[PDB]
Design a protein around this ligand. Structure first.
Ligand SMILES: O=c1[nH]c(=O)c2nn[nH]c2[nH]1
Ligand SMILES: O=c1[nH]c(=O)c2nn[nH]c2[nH]1
Ligand SMILES: O=c1[nH]c(=O)c2nn[nH]c2[nH]1
Ligand SMILES: O=c1[nH]c(=O)c2nn[nH]c2[nH]1
Ligand code: NA
Ligand code: NA
Ligand code: NA
Ligand code: NA
Lengths: 295, 295, 295, 295
């Protein structure tokens, strides 16, 4: 037998960092969960019990903390690039590093209309994420994403004109609830190394903000013909606004809210134009995906 | 043997309701999870297989939907009172109804600085809850709460002067991170019935808003001597602002963020005044509770 | 204002202990999650920022580890009694200790038909729990439980003869699926102190085993008239088998599996006697509770 | 812009099926969670609001139920192949179907030493899974797996001889706890179609059983030099026992149990050879992966 692929490292490394502005007293906090997996000339640890090639996972953990102490942790695209580059440069036999970062929200509190200098709220379980693959000789590949953005619109969603056959019971509709949890990923053009990543630093936060804004505005304003049609419009707009993105991927569940026929009870009307009370369905759910690129 | 206590009903009933203003086009959505448990002269269903005394749990579910169709679902204190009263009035042998409601956030989206008429975001997993106990002959007891409000302050928290003995390793500190998930409950004076609950309807939303505001402002502004001391200040202020509340209860975890000594690595300084990178701890956690009432 | 109640301590303390038999080489492992909350003359920590009365939660954590090192951790009723007694005896101003223990399963593996001396499997998320309340002057109150025991029977469950009115749509049935997650609690007679708890040590494991056996056998064998009727039979039998138990409480969800009418598709018959494929429902669920005591 | 990839369908479809042996009275239950995603000539649903190419996700759900009614649901490799083949044969414009099945445990209860004919227990959250990709013109690709198998050994695990540099604090050890959650996947050779899958039906359950047995026996018996070395031995043995498997992949977390130094308290010895009480760590965790194939 032979090792066809192998990677190993440390997952679920929770990290907090504070920045203190000595002039103003304002403090800013960052909290992340980090995973680093390494690849390289490590097969003999599997086949021959040769631990000499293993950078211990505990040491990977220490390295995450040290790197966060010595470098900016924002934007996460930069921090993940620094962290990944470290492993391939430090260890001759390590040839790829895969860094995943989940950023948690700590939003500054407003107290009496004023931003508070050192108090924060978790205002959403929405995350901002990065996946950074640093491969020796092949540069740095970055996928940025937002996830856990949960939205609902109560009208201006339709679904008609779909295929009807002997397996079909769904009725066409011109007015339904649309609710989803948005997972959106933008893949950057390959970067040659850390100097090129640093040269683009301003674009990372700006592109995250644009992706979020486009997602929310398009969801709210589109008189949606389907999840498919609405998500394509979102992706097109993101590509138009940032030329350094190569592809945009969306993964959207369709979280169903069913009408409840109450006509058996005193003729109560609660369907169609009279629908007011609905039953949210926990499962099953539709799942719609698309990857959009340039022509 | 004998039945000393019994209650039964339906849990995890998900309910959505939409209100449509025909004049303006503005729609407003409400989403809740409801549990109703009944008590009364039901022991023979347990002891003698006598199902004639059972209002089926499926029928309880139907009743929740019908009641939501025919009545306001907000404030939840009112809806829960209507729902509980229904069971004790409709069924002669049912003498108590226990209604728990969890309200989920659907906050109206702002698009280009304007509130959108029919699009919403789940802006927090914070919940607004009610527990309503309707007992025949004894009125209506309401406990209102907020839960899942997660906050952090990066300084202006201290903890010194605690008991030190042979079990103690904790160092005194004059500057630490304080983070918690707030669970706050206010218990209303007993109401005689639905007419009295209706007479106080404006106070329910106002008191929830006050409880939230006091919690956030006190957390942000107090130079905290302990979780205990800060939570007592919150409770006092809520009692001062609403005379119809009898008690306020807080349950606060102390979610620890530990310093990381990096001095073993090239003498890096990351403790005390030099602490920048911390390790959030998933467990264990402190748990601090208090119930405050009037003198 | 005044403090009406207060308790504080440490939650989610994970503990593992190994026992090694030097004669045989056999090792046995125990893993628990422990919470300890204290009460006593502690109000001034809340009202006056007086930390001198606070046994730090970190010290409570240390005490859990030390107590586990120096004492048996099984049965959990004994360990929780030792731990709770420690706090009220050590600290003059602490007058009650509330200890909750969740025991996790590590079942010895059988390899080639033989029990392995040091390898274990988590064979269920079923838990064995204890709640121990040690109150100065009032002895030791112990509630023992099992939870997370998930069962299903595919026939020999009925539900007919329930109340039918204008809120009822449920059809009577003489053959349905019954599935639940069992939470069963037995409350021991009050014990005067640790000497009396020790005197009854053999009864704790034996009574847990009996409660589990009775639950499973009664569920499997009863031609159930309702959840209510079946759970009462379980409780009666436990009380009959252990005279030192005062009450038994069951809390059972009714986890619904719905028939799927497929007759719209080529006349396929999948209801009633022809039902083979069902839709498990995640929510809502029935919730049935009873507490049974002696006459 | 252009659609580079697209797939859509229904997730989290819960399905139960019962088989009743009329001769013996014995009933057997199966419960699964199914996801089906389709690909094909569907881009215009995204780009042009053309729903005529959409087989509605609701219809996919109906098809899962109908297919389960008309066909065996075990082994899951067969059921997933039937389900996937259905979509590519029924719909000319659908060219791939991706079927994921999670099988939940319902193990027959033993009551008084005898297997009960119709009562079952969820004896583990361990799952048996399949991923079946049916691609028009390219056959059927099946990946079978087990997941959620949680094990611990209290000794006979070592970890020494790893790389030591300025980032390393971990001490070498010759005796530690090893605990993990096993995720093991075996990838079958490509099958030409449903006839070939049916021809191999007996091998599916047998290979699952072998994979489980090899995993448990190797974990229990290996005096482990590292997670890496132990998992490679498991994979080699599975490949040796089933020639129709092309690769085996393991993904193993290293769930750390830390020693607790108690020497600060009365010189208590709880490290090294005296270690009895340990602190299980919820995070971070090591994560070790390998894919093994033939030479
Ligand atoms: O937007 C939708 N897309 C779909 O593919 C679908 N199928 N059922 N409902 C649906 N709604
Ligand atoms: O605010 C705090 N209260 C406590 O009771 C405590 N114990 N350890 N740390 C603590 N912090
Ligand atoms: O066993 C049952 N008990 C109940 O109270 C009930 N209500 N609906 N179905 C039920 N099944
Ligand atoms: O088995 C192990 N493998 C590793 O790669 C490792 N790193 N720290 N500890 C470890 N244990
Ligand atoms: Na390298
Ligand atoms: Na009544
Ligand atoms: Na005392
Ligand atoms: Na086809």
């Amino acid at each position: 037998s032979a090792v066809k692929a192998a990677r190993y490292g440390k997952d679920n490394v929770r990290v907090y960092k504070v920045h203190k502005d000595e002039k103003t007293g304002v403090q800013t906090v960052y909290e992340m969960t980090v995973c680093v997996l390494l690849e390289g000339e490590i097969e003999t640890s599997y086949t021959k019990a040769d631990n000499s090639v293993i950078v211990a996972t505990d040491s990977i953990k220490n390295t995450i903390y040290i790197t966060a102490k010595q470098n900016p942790v924002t934007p996460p695209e930069l921090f993940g690039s620094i962290l990944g580059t470290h492993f391939i440069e430090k260890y001759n036999h390590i040839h790829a590093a895969h860094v995943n970062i989940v950023c948690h929200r700590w939003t500054r509190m407003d107290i009496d209309g004023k931003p508070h200098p050192h108090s924060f709220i978790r205002d959403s379980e929405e995350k901002r994420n990065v996946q950074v693959d640093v491969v020796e000789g092949k540069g740095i590949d970055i996928k940025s994403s937002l996830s856990g953005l949960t939205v609902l619109k109560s009208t201006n969603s339709q679904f008609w004109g779909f295929l009807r056959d002997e397996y079909t019971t769904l009725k066409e509709t011109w007015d339904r609830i649309l609710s989803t949890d948005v997972d959106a990923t933008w893949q950057w053009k390959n970067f040659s190394g850390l100097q090129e990543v640093r040269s683009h630093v301003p674009k990372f936060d700006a592109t995250w903000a644009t992706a979020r804004e486009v997602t929310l505005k398009t969801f709210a304003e589109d008189n949606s013909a389907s999840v498919q049609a609405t998500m394509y419009k979102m992706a097109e707009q993101i590509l138009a606004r940032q030329q350094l993105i190569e592809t945009v991927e969306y993964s959207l569940p369709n979280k169903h809210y069913f009408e409840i026929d109450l006509s058996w009870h005193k003729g109560l009307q609660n369907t169609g134009k009279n629908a007011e009370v609905f039953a949210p369905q926990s499962d099953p759910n539709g799942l719609i995906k698309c990857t959009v690129g340039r022509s």
